[model samples]
Target: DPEVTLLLQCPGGGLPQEQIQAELSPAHDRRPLPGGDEAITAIWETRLKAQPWLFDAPKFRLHSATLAPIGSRGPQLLLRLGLTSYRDFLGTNWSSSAAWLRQQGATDWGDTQAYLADPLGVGAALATADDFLVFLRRSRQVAEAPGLVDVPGGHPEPQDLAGQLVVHELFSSVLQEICDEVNLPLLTLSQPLLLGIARNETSAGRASAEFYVQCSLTSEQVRKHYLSGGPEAHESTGIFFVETQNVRRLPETEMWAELCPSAKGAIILYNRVQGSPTGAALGSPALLPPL
Candidate 1:
């Protein structure tokens, strides 16, 4: 319990500090997308040649926004795209041998280094039914995090938009991610709660926005459904879990060290709402029901 106290002192369980600033860039905000299109287009072309899987994959513009402090009675969410696909966002980070040398004194091209983060990437806690299903990213040379811990949802992409701009916004992406990454039926889970938001800034003029949700489904049936056939086997090395009863029993440091930034932020909010006094007033749906 004492250890739990330490986790709340900082966002994402005391993760490292970064210099990038965060702002509301939602659709209604009507701000221009970050960075320039010409540079992004050239980089995307180079990226497609190097990565066969992404070839011809229809990508679209997406955004990240915030809800300020929605303690329950939800406030209107902000709508803003990072102005690029997640894959394209990844492309910005790749560098060749000569590229690295140039970057040794890389001059500024007026590029803004920022990554788009989704608000409320839904995370469900399954208890009594069994453990909390989580994602362990593959550490292979070709994978996104190479061996770090990550949650199932990726950045919202074009397909998730479903032909509408900001109408219902991220909810659609959450549904698509559940189907694509976890193979879990969106109907099985409860509506998500605003757990927390995370933004990451990079030196490559990249910034990321991550919104986390602590939504839950009670039955072990839901867990069984995911373990049986859910999960994008190719993308994830393994689906992991933490015992609901034993979550507080684990060492906080070990727990914090194992999770990615977004996961850390989501879990922290989940735990706080489940156990804290302030949680009583937070007014969100139950993330997990008793088995």
Candidate 2:
């Protein structure tokens, strides 16, 4: 085995210091979604022109306080979509829920996994590019997690772009749906370096792009933010931060119930951060599992 080196904050991981993360005007590539013969690009462009809900120019109105666990609907640069930060969401135990739903003949149990579906757009390296990169999850349908797959995505319009404002939230709608269903606060887990984007598809699973983002926190610091036990965690069976090397061994079947594309999405993201001390994609991101 490679020498068990335990250290925090590897180089090239990200900026050596922290700065205020301001969510401002959506970063536009100005490339105007590539034209002709580009199905993926077309999907993005069509939605861009539609002006759906998430990107509704950050309107001032009373949004349903009940929409997200935390209300962030008015005049915000981006919308809070969903979560795929935890491993159990991709583990075999997760599938058990799906299987049980089938056995119980639940009508929309498959939809429970939907929360982890959307692709969140966050500004990566705002210090320069001011580029907006979408973060998503991916996996193999049989519970195997290794490759990078896009989140359960859907096309949205520019109006929706204010929050549901963009085209990729459909996949990530799972973040909101799952949290309400699973009752977990996703905001507990978001940062630049630890995030990633996966694309290469015509459909949700066909193509994906992996975006990488990382933020650091000491183990003690995390404990302060997330308490270990809660009612929703009862069915969780297992949850904890795994060592980057050990993460390789995490079974996909369980990680995302059926190893959906999102599971792969998480693995790909973690690998980007896991790198040699010199700051290479070593084994995982310098950060840990969502607390």
Model 1: which ten-residue window has the lowest total lDDT?
A: 12-21
Candidate 1, residue 181: lDDT: 60
Q: For model 1, how does the per-residue alpha-carbon lDDT over 75-109 read when each residue is reduced to its tens digit? A: 33433443344444444433332233224323442
lDDT (10s digit) by residue, model 2, range 1-291? 121111112223422113112121323111111122243334445555664442312211110111112233332222223222112122212333334322332233323122222222222211111222222233224233433323222322123324432323323343433233223345533433323333312111112222233224443433333345453433222223334444444444354333334334445444444432342443245533221
Error of 1 at 44 (Å): 3.4
Best by TM-score: 1
What are the per-model C-alpha RMSD values against the true structure?
A: 9.1, 17.2
Name model 2 segments beyond 4 Å from true.
1-182, 192-194, 200-245, 249-258, 279-291
Task: Quantify all predictions' global Cα lDDT against the true fold.
Answer: 0.41, 0.29
Best by lDDT: 1
Compared with the true structure, the alpha-carbon lDDT of candidate 1 equals: 0.41
Q: Tally clashing residue pairs in candidate 1.
A: 29
